[PDB]
Coordinates of C-alpha atoms and ligand atoms in Angstrom, one line a residue:
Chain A
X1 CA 178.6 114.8 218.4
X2 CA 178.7 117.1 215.2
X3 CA 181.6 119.1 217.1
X4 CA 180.0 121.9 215.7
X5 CA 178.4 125.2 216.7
X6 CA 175.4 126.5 214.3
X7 CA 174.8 129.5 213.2
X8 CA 170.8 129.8 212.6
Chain B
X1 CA 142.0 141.1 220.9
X2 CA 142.8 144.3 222.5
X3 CA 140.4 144.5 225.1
X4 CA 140.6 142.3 227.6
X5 CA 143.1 140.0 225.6
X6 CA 139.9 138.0 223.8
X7 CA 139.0 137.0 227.8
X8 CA 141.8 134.1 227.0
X9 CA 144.1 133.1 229.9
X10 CA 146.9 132.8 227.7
X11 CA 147.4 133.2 224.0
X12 CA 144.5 134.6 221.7
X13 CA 143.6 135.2 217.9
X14 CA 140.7 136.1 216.1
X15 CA 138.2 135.0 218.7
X16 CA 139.9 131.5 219.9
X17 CA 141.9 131.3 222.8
X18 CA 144.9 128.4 223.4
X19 CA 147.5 128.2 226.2
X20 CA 151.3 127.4 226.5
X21 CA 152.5 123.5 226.4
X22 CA 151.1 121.6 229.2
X23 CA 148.3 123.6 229.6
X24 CA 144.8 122.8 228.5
X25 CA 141.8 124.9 227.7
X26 CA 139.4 125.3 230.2
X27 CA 135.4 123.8 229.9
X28 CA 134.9 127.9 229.3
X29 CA 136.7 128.0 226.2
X30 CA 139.1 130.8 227.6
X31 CA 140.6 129.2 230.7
X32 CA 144.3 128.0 231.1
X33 CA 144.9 125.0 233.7
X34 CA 147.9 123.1 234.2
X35 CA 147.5 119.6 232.2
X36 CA 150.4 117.9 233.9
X37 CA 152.7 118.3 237.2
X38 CA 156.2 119.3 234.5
X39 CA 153.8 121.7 232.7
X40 CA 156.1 125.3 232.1
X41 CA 155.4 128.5 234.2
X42 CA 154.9 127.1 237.4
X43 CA 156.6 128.5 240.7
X44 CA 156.6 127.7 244.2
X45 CA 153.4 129.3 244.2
X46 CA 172.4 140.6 240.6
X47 CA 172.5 143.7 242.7
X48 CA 170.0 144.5 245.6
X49 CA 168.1 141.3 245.0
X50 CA 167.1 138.4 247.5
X51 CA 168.1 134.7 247.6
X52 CA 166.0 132.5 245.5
X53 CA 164.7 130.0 247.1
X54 CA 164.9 126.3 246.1
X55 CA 161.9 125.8 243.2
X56 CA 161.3 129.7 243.2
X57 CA 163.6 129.6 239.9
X58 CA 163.3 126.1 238.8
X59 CA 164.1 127.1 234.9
X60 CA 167.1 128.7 235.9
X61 CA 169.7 127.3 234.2
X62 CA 173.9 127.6 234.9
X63 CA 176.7 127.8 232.4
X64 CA 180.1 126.1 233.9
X65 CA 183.6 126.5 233.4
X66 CA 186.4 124.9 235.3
X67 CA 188.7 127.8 235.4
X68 CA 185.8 130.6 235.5
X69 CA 183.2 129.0 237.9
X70 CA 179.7 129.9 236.6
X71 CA 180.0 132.7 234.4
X72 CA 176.5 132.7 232.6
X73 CA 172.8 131.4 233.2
X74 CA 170.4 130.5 230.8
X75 CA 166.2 129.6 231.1
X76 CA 164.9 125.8 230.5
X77 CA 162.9 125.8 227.2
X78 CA 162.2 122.0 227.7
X79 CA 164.4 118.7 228.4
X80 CA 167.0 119.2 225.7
X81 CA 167.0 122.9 225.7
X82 CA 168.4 125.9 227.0
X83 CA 168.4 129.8 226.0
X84 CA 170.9 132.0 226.7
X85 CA 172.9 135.0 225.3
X86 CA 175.2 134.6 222.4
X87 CA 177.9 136.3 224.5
X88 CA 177.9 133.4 226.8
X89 CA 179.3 131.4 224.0
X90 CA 183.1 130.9 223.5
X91 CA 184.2 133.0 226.2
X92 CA 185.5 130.3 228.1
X93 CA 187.3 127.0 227.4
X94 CA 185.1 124.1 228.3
X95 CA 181.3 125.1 229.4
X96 CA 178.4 122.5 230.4
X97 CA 175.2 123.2 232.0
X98 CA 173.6 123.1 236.0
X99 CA 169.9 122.9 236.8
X100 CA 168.4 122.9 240.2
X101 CA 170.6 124.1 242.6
X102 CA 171.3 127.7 244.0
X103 CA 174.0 127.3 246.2
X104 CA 177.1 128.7 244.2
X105 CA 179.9 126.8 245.7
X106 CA 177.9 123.1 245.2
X107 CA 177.3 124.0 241.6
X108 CA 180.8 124.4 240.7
X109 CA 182.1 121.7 242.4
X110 CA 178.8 119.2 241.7
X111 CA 178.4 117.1 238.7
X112 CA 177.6 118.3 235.4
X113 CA 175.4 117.8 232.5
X114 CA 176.7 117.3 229.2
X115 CA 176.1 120.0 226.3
X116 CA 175.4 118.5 222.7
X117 CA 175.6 121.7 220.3
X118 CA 174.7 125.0 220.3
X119 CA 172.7 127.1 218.1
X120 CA 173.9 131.2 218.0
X121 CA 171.9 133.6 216.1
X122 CA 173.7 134.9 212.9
X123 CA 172.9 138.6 213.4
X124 CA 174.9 138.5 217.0
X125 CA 176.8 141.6 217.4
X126 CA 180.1 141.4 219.2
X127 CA 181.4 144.6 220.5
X128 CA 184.5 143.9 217.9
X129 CA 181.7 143.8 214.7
X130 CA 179.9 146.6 216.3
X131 CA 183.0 149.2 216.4
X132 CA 184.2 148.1 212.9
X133 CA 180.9 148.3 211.2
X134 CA 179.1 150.8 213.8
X135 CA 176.9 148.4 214.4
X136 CA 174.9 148.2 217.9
X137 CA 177.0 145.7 220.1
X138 CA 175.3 143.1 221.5
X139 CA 172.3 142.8 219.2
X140 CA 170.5 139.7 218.5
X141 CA 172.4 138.4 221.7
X142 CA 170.4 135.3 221.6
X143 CA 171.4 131.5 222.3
X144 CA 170.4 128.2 222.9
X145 CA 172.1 124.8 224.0
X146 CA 171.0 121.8 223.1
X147 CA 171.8 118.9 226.3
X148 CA 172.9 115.7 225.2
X149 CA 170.4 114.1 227.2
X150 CA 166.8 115.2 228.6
X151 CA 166.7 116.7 231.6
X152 CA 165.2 115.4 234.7
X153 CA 162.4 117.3 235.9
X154 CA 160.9 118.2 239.1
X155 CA 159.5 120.7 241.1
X156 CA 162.6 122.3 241.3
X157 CA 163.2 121.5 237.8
X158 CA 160.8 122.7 235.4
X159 CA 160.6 125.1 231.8
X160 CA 159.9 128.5 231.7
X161 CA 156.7 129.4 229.6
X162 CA 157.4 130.7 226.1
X163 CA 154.5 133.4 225.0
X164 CA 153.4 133.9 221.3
X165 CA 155.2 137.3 219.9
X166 CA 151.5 139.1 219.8
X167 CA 150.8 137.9 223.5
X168 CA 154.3 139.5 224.9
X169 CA 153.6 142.3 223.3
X170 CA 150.5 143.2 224.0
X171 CA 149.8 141.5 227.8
X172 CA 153.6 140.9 228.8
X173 CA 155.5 143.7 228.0
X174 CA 152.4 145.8 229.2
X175 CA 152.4 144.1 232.8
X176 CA 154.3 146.4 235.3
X177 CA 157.3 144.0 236.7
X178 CA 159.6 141.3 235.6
X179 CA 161.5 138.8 237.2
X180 CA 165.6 138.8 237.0
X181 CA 168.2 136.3 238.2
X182 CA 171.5 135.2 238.2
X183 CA 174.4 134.1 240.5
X184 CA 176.4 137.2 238.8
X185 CA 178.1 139.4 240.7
X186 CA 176.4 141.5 244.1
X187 CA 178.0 144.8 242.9
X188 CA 179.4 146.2 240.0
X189 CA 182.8 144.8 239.3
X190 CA 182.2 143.2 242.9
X191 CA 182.6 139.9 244.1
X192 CA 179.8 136.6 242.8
X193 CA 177.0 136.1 244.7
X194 CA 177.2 132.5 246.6
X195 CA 174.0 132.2 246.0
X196 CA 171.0 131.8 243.6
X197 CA 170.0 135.9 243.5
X198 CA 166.1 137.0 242.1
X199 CA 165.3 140.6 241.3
X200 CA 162.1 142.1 240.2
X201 CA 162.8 145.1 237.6
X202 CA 160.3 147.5 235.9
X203 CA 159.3 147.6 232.1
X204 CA 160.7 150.9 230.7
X205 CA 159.2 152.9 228.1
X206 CA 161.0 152.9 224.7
X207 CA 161.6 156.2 224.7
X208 CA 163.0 157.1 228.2
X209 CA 165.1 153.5 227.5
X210 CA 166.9 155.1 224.5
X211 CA 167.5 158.7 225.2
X212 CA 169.3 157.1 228.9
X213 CA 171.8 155.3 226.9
X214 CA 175.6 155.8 225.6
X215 CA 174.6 153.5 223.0
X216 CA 171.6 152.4 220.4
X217 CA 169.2 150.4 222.2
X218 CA 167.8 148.6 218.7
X219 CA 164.1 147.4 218.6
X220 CA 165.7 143.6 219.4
X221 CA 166.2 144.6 222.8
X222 CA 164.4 146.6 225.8
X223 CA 165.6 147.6 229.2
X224 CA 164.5 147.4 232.7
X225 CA 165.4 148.8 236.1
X226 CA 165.2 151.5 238.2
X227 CA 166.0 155.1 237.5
X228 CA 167.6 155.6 241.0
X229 CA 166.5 152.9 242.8
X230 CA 170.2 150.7 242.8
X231 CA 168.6 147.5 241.8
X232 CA 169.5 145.6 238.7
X233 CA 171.4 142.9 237.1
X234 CA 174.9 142.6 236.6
X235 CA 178.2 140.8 235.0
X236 CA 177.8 137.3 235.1
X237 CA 173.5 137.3 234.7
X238 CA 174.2 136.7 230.9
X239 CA 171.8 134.9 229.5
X240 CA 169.5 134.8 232.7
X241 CA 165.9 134.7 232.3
X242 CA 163.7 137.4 232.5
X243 CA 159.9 136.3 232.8
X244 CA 156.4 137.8 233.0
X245 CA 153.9 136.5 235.8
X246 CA 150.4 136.6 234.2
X247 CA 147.9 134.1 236.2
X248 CA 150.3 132.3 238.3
X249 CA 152.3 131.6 235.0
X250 CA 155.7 132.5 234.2
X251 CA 156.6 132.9 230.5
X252 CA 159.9 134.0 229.1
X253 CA 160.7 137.5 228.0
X254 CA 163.7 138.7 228.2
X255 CA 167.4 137.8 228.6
X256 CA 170.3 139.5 230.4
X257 CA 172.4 140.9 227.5
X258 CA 174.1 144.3 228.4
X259 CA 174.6 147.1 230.3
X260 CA 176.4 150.3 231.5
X261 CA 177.4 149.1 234.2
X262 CA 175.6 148.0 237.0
X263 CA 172.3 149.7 239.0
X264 CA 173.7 153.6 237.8
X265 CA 171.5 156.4 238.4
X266 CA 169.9 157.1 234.8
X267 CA 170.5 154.2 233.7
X268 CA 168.6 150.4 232.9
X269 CA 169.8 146.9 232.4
X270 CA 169.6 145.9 228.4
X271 CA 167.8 142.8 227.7
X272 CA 166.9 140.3 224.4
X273 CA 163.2 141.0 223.3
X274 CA 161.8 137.6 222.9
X275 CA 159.1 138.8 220.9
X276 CA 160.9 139.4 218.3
X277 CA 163.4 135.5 218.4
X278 CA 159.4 134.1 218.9
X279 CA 160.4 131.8 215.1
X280 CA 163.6 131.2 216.1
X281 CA 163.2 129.7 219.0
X282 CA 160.2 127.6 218.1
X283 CA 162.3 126.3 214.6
X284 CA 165.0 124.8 216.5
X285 CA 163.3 123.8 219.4
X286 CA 160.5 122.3 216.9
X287 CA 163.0 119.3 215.6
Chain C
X1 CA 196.7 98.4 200.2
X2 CA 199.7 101.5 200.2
X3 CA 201.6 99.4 197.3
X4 CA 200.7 102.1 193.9
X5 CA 197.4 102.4 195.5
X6 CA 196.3 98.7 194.7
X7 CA 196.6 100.2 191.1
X8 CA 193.1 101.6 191.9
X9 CA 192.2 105.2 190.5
X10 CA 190.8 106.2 193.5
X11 CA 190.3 104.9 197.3
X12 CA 191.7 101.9 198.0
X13 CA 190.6 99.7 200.9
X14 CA 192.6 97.0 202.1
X15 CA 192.3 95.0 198.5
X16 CA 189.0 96.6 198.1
X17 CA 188.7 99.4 195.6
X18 CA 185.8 102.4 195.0
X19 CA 185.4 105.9 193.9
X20 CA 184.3 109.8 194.6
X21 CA 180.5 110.3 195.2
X22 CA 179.3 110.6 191.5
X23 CA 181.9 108.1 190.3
X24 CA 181.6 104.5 188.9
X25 CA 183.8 101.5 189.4
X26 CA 185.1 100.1 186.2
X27 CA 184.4 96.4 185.3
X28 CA 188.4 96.0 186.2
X29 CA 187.6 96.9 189.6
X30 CA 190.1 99.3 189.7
X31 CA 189.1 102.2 186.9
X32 CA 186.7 105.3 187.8
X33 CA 184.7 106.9 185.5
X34 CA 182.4 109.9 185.6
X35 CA 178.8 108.9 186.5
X36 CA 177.0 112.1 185.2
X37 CA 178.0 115.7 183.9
X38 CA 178.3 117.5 187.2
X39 CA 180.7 114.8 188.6
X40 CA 182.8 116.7 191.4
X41 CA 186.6 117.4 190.6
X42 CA 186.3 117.9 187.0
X43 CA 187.1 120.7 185.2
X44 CA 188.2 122.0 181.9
X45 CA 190.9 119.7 181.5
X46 CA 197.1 135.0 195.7
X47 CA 200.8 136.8 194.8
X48 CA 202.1 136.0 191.4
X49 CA 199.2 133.9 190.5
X50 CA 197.1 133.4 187.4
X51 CA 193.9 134.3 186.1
X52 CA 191.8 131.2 186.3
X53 CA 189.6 131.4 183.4
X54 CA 185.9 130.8 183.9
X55 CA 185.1 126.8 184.3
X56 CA 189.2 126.4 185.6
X57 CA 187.8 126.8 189.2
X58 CA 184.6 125.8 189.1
X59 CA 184.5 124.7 193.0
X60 CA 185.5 128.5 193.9
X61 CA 182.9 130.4 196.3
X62 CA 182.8 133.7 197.0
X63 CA 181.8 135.2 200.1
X64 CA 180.3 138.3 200.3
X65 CA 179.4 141.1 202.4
X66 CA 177.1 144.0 201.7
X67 CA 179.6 146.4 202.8
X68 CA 183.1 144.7 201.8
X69 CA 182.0 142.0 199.2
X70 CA 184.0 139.3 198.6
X71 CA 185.9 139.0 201.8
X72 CA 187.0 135.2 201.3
X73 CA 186.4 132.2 199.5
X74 CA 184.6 128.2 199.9
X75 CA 184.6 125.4 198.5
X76 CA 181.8 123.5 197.0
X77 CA 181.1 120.2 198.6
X78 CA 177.7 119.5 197.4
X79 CA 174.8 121.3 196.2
X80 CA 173.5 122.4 199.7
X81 CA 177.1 122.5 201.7
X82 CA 179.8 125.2 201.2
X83 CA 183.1 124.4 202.7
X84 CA 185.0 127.4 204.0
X85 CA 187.2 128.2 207.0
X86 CA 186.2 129.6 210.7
X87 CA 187.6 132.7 210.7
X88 CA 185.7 133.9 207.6
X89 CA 182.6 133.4 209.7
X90 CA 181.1 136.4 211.9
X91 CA 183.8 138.8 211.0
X92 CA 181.3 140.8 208.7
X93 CA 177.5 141.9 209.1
X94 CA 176.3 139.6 206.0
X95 CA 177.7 136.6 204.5
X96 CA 176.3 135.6 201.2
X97 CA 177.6 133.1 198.3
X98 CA 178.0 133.7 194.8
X99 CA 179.7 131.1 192.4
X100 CA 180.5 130.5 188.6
X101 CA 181.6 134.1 188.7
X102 CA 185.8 135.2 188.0
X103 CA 184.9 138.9 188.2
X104 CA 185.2 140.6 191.5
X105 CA 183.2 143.6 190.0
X106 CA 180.4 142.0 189.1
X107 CA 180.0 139.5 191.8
X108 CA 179.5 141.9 194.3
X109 CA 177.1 143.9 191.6
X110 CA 174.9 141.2 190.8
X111 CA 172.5 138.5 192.6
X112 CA 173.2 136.5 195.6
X113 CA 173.1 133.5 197.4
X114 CA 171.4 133.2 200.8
X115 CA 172.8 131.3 203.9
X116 CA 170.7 129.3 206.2
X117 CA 173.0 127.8 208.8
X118 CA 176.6 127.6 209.1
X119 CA 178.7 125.0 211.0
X120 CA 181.6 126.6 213.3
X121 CA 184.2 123.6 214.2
X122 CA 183.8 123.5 217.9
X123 CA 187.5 123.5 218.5
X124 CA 187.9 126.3 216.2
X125 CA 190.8 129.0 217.8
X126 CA 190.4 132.7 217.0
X127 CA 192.9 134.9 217.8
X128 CA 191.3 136.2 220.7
X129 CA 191.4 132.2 222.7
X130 CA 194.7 131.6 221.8
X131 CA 196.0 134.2 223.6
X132 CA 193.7 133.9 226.5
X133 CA 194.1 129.9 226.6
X134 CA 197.8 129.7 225.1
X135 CA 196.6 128.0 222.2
X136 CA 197.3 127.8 218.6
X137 CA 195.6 130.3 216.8
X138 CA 193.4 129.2 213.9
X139 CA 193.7 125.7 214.6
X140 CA 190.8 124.1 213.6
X141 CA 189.9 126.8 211.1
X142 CA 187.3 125.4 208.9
X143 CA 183.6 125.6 208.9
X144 CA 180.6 124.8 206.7
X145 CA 177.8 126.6 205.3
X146 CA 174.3 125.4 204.3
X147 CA 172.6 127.1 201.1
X148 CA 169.1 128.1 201.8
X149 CA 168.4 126.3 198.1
X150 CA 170.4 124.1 196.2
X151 CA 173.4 125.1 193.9
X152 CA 172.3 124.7 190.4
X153 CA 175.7 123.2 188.2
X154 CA 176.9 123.2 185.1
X155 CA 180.3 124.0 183.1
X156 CA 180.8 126.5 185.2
X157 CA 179.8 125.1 189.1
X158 CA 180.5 121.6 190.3
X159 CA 181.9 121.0 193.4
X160 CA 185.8 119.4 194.7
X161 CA 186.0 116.2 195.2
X162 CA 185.8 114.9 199.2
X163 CA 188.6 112.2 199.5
X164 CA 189.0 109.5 201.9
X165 CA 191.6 110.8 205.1
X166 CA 194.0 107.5 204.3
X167 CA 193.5 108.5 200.0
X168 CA 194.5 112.0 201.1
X169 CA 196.8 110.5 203.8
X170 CA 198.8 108.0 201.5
X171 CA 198.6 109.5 197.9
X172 CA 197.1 113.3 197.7
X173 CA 199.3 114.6 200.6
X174 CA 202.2 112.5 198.6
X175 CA 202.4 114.5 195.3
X176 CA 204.7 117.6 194.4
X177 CA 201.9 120.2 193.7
X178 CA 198.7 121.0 195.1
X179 CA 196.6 124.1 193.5
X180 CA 194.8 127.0 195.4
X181 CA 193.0 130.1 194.2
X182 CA 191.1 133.2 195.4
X183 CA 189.9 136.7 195.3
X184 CA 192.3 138.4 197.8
X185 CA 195.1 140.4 197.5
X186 CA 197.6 140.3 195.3
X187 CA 200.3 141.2 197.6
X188 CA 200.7 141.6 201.3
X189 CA 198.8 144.8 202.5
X190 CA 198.2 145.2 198.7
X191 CA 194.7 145.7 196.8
X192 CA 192.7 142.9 196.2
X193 CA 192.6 141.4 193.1
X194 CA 189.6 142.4 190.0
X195 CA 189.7 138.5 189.0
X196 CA 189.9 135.2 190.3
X197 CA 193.3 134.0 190.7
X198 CA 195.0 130.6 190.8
X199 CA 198.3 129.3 192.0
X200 CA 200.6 126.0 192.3
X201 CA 201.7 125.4 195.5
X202 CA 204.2 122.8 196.0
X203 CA 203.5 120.8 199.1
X204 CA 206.4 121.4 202.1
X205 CA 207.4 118.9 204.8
X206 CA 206.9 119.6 208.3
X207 CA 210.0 120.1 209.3
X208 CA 210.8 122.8 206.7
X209 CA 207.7 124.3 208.3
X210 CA 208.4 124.1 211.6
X211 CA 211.5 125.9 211.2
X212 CA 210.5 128.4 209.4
X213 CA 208.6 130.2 211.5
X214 CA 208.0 131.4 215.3
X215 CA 204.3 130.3 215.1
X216 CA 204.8 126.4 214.6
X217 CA 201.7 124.7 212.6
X218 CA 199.7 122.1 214.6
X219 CA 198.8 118.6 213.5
X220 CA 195.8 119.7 212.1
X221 CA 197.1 122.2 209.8
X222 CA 200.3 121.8 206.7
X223 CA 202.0 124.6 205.3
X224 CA 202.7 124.9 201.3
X225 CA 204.3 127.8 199.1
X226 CA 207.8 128.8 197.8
X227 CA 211.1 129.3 199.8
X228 CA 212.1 132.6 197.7
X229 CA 209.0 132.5 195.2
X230 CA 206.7 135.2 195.5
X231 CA 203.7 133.3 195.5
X232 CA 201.1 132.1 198.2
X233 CA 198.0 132.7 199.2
X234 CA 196.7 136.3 200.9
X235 CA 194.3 138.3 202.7
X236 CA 190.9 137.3 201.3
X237 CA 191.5 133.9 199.9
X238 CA 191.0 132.4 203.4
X239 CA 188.3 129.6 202.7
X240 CA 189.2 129.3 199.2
X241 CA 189.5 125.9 198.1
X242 CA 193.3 123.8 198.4
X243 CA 193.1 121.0 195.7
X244 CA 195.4 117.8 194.7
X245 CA 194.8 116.5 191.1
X246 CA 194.9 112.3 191.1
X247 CA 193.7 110.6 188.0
X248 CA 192.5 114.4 186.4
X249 CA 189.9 114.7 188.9
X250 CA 190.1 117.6 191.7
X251 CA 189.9 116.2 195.4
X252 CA 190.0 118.6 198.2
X253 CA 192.9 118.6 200.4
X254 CA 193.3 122.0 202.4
X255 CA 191.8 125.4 203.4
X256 CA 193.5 128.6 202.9
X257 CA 193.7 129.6 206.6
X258 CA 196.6 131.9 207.3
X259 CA 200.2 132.7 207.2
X260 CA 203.2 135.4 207.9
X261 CA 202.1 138.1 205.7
X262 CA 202.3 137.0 202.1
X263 CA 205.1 135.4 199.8
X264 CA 207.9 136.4 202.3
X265 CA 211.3 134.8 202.1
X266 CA 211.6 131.3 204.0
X267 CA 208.3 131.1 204.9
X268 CA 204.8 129.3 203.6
X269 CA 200.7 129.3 203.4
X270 CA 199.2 127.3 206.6
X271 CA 196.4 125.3 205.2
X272 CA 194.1 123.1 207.1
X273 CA 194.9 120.1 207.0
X274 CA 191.4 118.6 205.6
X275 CA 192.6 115.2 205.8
X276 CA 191.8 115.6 209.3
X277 CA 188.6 116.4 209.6
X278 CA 187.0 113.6 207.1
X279 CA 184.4 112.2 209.3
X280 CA 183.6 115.8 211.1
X281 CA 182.8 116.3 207.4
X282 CA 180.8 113.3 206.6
X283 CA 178.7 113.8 209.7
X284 CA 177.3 117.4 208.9
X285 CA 177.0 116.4 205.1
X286 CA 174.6 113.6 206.2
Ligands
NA1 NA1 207.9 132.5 200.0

């Protein structure tokens, strides 16, 4: 898990 | 490809036809037949809606919270893949995903798959960006969770078909109805459905969509409904699907973003226009 | 290996000894030296700060925003990555990057640098969750953004250097003074500066920090200023880069994340705590 939420 | 859509089934460009994953090109060269028992689009076959039954609404997916219950939905793209609305995301404090069931109550309390990340689209417009900067709340209000593990298909279980940008706009959008659904709630600022509710709403023309509205409908979004007719969706439909049938196929094309709120005389539901998030969707889900 | 650091320049690994990415290890096994010219943490050697002179800072990003520019500050990790904190991220319409620059004028005047993604800390607490949730707000407020294209260096660019969490831990965290710098205002509800400033900030203990105020600094987080001193960081230098000088190379040790207004009496700068978040680091770089 990158723990992480991307923003595209 | 105007007339007649090029004769293709699905998707066309000149001509030469093609059709969505898991479909093959029939011995005609314009057909469209399902190539495997998974493939996307295929169907047993919220206010003022019916109960959708088991496998009616097999991509219908359903955001989690342990305090909040299910407070979103979202459409199966494939396995490992969800959309949904960006306002879905961090509204809650934990959130996991729910795939074939419709009962309300055995959701909640059920297991619950695992969510991996989750991709939100940079443009997203809270209503806090929109008032500072005037901006049109809720735009780009696009999503997509990526499970930690595949999901298990069945024919309850199965992807939503996702059209090329031309072919929504020019055979999709065009069609008369759409399908909406969501366990959100029955009745404005009313109680959550206990079940799995499906709706079926009317494209509405541009035009007649923005002069209705308090606020900018941008060209990212498009709204459906009835003018009078008190059917719509509603809190807690977030990031529910919106799909066109064209030949016994279901594709993906819109997704329960906002509204003023809910089934009000003069007034439509707002929703994503996948035709324009056609790139985005297929970079990540391409990976 | 906590006795002087094994006598080791760098990271020290009970005793086994190494170096910052772009660093060699001497034939004493204990010396670092710089393996090219852009070799991260070297240099050329906010209230009340100073004007850092062009290639003092050479880590410093600047965010910008078509309609506010320069709204906060990053911190260069690599040529593709952009450290910065949470809170900078989706409070604006645009975000781009612009670096090498000192001038808040012509930064926002000249050409940019685009964003492709940008990596949110799950965890991350805006104010909005820690009052729905009770939790602390801005904990876990750091974030990282990913150039479109890479960052070209020279004199003027190179990034911080990323040290190891027991490094920053045992040593870093350890020493008097840690420096920070920015573009935002130069006093609490005051204008924002025309140049990139810089400041000393001497490192505070814990306690000192929990006492000082009625919002208490998580684990995650460490607070450094001046008791009576009028300097800290500000509005606007959230993101900007929080670095500890070991050996006279630059490793990255906080982010500006927030505070009680700025430079007030008995009170300090919050920084995250980067120590922390090492791995969560070394996962997205890969
Ligand atoms: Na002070």
């Amino acid at each position: 898990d990158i723990f992480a939420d991307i923003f595209i | 490809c105007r007339v007649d859509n090029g004769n293709c089934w699905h998707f066309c460009k000149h001509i030469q036809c093609s059709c969505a994953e898991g479909y093959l090109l029939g011995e005609d060269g314009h057909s469209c037949v399902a190539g495997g028992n998974f493939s996307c689009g295929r169907n047993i076959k919220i206010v003022n809606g019916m109960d959708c039954k088991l496998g009616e609404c097999p991509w219908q997916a359903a955001l989690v919270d342990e305090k909040e219950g299910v407070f979103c939905g979202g459409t199966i793209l494939s396995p490992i893949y969800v959309l949904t609305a960006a306002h879905c995301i961090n509204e809650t404090e934990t959130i996991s995903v729910v795939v074939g069931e419709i009962d309300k109550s055995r959701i909640e309390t059920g297991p619950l798959l695992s969510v991996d990340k989750i991709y939100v689209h940079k443009k997203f417009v809270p209503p806090q960006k929109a008032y500072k900067f005037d901006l049109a709340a809720y735009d780009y209000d696009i999503a997509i969770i990526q499970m930690k593990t595949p999901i298990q298909f069945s024919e309850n279980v199965v992807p939503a078909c996702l059209p090329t940008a031309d072919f929504a706009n020019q055979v999709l959008m065009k069609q008369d109805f759409g399908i909406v659904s969501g366990f959100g709630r029955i009745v404005e600022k009313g109680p959550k459905s206990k079940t799995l509710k499906v709706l079926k709403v009317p494209y509405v023309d541009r035009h007649t969509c923005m002069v209705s509205s308090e606020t900018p409908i941008t060209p990212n979004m498009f709204c459906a409904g009835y003018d009078t007719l008190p059917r719509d969706a509603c809190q807690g439909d977030s990031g529910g699907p919106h799909t066109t049938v064209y030949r016994d196929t279901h594709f993906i094309t819109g997704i329960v973003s906002s509204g003023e709120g809910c089934a009000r005389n003069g007034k439509y539901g707002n929703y994503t226009k996948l035709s324009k998030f056609i790139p985005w969707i297929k970079r990540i889900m391409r990976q």
